[PDB]
Design a binder for this molecule. Structure first.
Ligand SMILES: Nc1ncnc2c1ncn2[C@@H]1O[C@H](COP(=O)(O)OP(N)(=O)O)[C@@H](O)[C@H]1O
Ligand SMILES: Nc1ncnc2c1ncn2[C@@H]1O[C@H](COP(=O)(O)OP(N)(=O)O)[C@@H](O)[C@H]1O
Lengths: 490, 501
């Protein structure tokens, strides 16, 4: 757990030392009161002291509950929100909400199929009020000062000594990945060591900078999260989300028939859908969807890992290239065409197939085939199914494995939002899944195992471009989750 | 210089080929109705169809004129707004603005020297209104369907055939920089050709990928803008803002005393402040501030160029390294300490000094000094001034050339806002500078020479032992091609192509 001197490591500075930070920090309401976890907790603590503001937060928490409610419980939530916050026989808790908006809610909640978006305008108007005088007043409170103290701690130096380095978990191209624990909080992570000599030999400079950047831009429950970055004399280290449930390749082959029950594949595909949507919201194309790249956690939840090939596509632009893994590349990828997010939707089709069948759609397990031929199979050969796949599972795979990207499921403008509407995900509540409220079908088994160069000045010019050390939101979450925020804030 | 068949090149698709776009476009008001120039023009066109919506636009535009108003004109400008939008109880054009917001506005406008932010809460409420039902209604309009058509044109292929290639402008480190023109619009750009063989030999893959990204991320009148990106069998090409007026090194030395008047230098330093503010709000540290890296345009406005060394710093993180040019590196840099944006404020100090004096602060012109000794001067020696400097110029240099970054001007929690507040800038109205309403003291003369030439030929270099393999293709895959949205949309409007379609 926590170290003996944890309170000395995580000691808040005096408020006077936070003066530079106070004036320099951009006074953005969405960031400081919502997106930054400590900021959100402290603004809510401030609201708790003002009765009118406390009701606004309760209303937002009630709307969040409604948004994640089960279909047979949604109308009860909605009616409850109306009774508690818009009781006409009582005064107005939320006066700034226009009567026409209140009225529209009452009408949308009469309908037997109520829109999970029924309170969005009420929500938007509530935040408009909060980002005004309440936000101004919060900035002049003791709670904001406390937020600035945490913000100061957050920018404190990060070195190998911030962690305890345990057993090697795996071996990569640029080095090894080992299990590490933050000394101050006891939080466990995966420390991916990228050896400087290995980066130089394999020309992985642009790659390393890219992964780093991609991992910090993405804020997803289904994508491996970067919490820290540091440098040693030998390596550039990435401190990532620990996934000790093994990769999907291990579960399909080493523990599989090969393959596993449809219900699992469907659950994993649902999560992969959300991960892809999270990446696509950031205009990122993953490029290397394969079982070996999907990892499982202790709870049985998955995350996309290996973001080396992932690339951000600016608006009004396309990428090209035959990149990825032989057998997983989309027709446009093997044809070296100009494309955007289409390869990922194809990749999902490959994954669902491999999970159910027990081999990739255009390459058998172990199969000794030249790359040159696997590419022709991707371009021309069709994929044969079995009664391992339900009629719905055969449909999502057929739609995702369509050769022409413009006719492919998820590439016709509907995006992940559309892919989610497929009849395979009938039994799945995506709002609950996206909120970590759905239990996985399977859970990994505890105890059980699941798995000449000389540095010069041009290398120094590459290390200068590498920033250290902590990642803001993941760090603030670690502070809250570990109990350190509670035991210091009190 | 529009194409003959320009209307054929810029043909809008039917609103069926845009059905895809309509469902995949994130409905963000700030992006679709403000940041994106064509989205902004089309939502404003939709607003003209509704008198209440038309009034909100009139108000936002009136507040925008208030903000850029000269110090004497401002009070009467403010009063006219009050007179047009808040003086009638039964005929209120903006009813959703609470009377308490209007009360605070009238208070701060009653006094002499009113805040240029007097209508900032009024503006916030007007946008909250527009971001609601008017925005939802806009999404079902014919005006929004046109936006989807323009967005489809923007995603259309870009190659070497999109441009007319003109004269070579200069010799870059990775290839030729030449004057090029978009065929369909006739707009002139500078096409930086980065040779595939030169990038390989120099190991500039990370650098090229980073430069591209930074140029698309920054939206500044004071930073060279990337408008397009395309690929050739032998090069990666960046289509950039054409800067005919030459660089600052040429103006300081070649046609300078060495140096030029304080009045010019101060205008450049003010424009540089804006550029550095723009880079910092995108969390970027430029790192290579030096005269040759600041270019002039045909009107006499400057822009920070060569964003090769520029680094984006994630929040709560720091960079290190002794990088940049010898004589221009800050103490934290020479000592290889961990830092953020401090080297850029030191850099502004080095620039102001050189422009006024005629040589860098710790190295005389063309002096043969060992880099190690140059570093020692940067760390210990204090820069000497002359009578070429007014009292306020010496003040800005001494504060920007503070050895300890924690004591340096711009680095103490005040940023660019605090630097802009320095007495040297008393004669500059920053709101007008940022809005491009200030005329520069110096304007380049056409027919006059502003750079070293450069024969209008070649591209040729040392390419022996260089072979493009699989690893190179793995890098080209990462380089996206096409246009850069905001630059592209501005170009469509400026060229009149949007107006004539
Ligand atoms: N986040 C993580 N949690 C647990 N183990 C992890 C991990 N990230 C990587 N690993 C392990 O380290 C091995 C190598 O890391 P990897 O990312 O696959 O390197 P690579 N394929 O680019 O060469 C992985 O195959 C896996 O066994
Ligand atoms: N945006 C631009 N507009 C007009 N001319 C430009 C330009 N960017 C570069 N040039 C010209 O090409 C020359 C070399 O470009 P440069 O920025 O130094 O490329 P680099 N850093 O790889 O050496 C400049 O000195 C200038 O003459």
């Amino acid at each position: 757990g926590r170290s003996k001197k944890w309170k000395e490591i995580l000691t808040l500075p005096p408020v006077s030392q936070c003066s530079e930070l106070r004036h320099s920090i951009e006074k953005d309401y969405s960031s400081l009161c919502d997106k930054q976890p400590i900021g959100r907790r402290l603004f809510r603590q401030f609201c708790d002291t003002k009765p009118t503001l406390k009701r606004h937060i309760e209303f937002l928490d009630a709307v969040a509950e409604y948004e994640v409610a089960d279909d047979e419980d949604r109308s009860d939530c909605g009616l409850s929100i109306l009774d508690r916050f818009f009781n006409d026989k009582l005064a107005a808790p939320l006066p700034e909400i226009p009567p026409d908006v209140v009225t529209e809610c009452r009408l949308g909640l009469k309908e037997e199929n109520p829109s999970k978006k029924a309170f969005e305008e009420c929500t938007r108007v509530a935040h408009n009020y909060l980002r005004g005088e309440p936000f101004e007043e919060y900035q002049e409170s003791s709670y904001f000062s406390q937020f600035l103290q945490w913000k100061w701690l957050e920018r404190q130096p990060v070195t190998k000594n911030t962690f305890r380095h345990y057993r090697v978990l795996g071996k990569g191209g640029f080095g090894e990945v080992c299990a590490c624990q933050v000394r101050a909080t006891g939080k466990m992570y995966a420390c991916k060591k990228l050896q400087k000599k290995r980066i130089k030999k394999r020309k992985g400079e642009a790659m390393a900078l890219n992964e780093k950047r991609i991992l910090e831009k993405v804020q997803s429950r289904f994508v491996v999260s970067l919490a820290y970055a540091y440098e040693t004399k030998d390596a550039l280290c990435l401190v990532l989300t620990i996934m000790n449930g093994g990769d999907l390749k291990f579960h399909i082959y080493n523990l599989g028939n090969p393959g596993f029950d449809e219900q699992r594949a469907v659950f994993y595909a649902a999560e992969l859908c959300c991960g892809l949507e999270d990446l696509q919201r950031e205009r990122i194309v993953y490029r290397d969807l394969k079982p070996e790249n999907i990892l499982l956690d202790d709870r049985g939840h998955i995350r996309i890992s290996d973001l080396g090939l992932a690339t951000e596509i600016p608006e009004g632009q396309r990428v090209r290239g035959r990149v990825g893994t032989v057998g997983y590349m989309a027709p446009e990828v093997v044809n070296n065409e100009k494309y955007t997010f289409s390869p990922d939707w194809w990749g999902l089709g490959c994954l669902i197939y491999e999970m159910i069948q027990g081999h990739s759609p255009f390459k058998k397990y172990k199969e000794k085939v030249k790359w040159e031929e696997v590419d022709q199979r991707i371009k021309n050969d069709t994929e044969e199914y079995s009664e391992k796949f339900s009629e719905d599972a055969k449909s999502i795979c057929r739609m995702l494995l369509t050769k022409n990207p413009s006719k492919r499921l998820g590439c016709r403008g509907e995006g992940a939002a559309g892919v989610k509407q497929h009849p395979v995900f009938k039994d799945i509540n995506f709002r609950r899944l996206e909120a970590n409220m759905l239990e996985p079908p399977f859970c990994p088994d505890p105890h059980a195992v699941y798995c000449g160069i000389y540095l010069d000045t041009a290398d120094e010019d590459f290390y200068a471009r590498f920033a250290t050390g902590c990642v803001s939101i993941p760090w603030q979450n670690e502070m809250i989750e570990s109990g350190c925020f509670k035991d210091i804030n009190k």
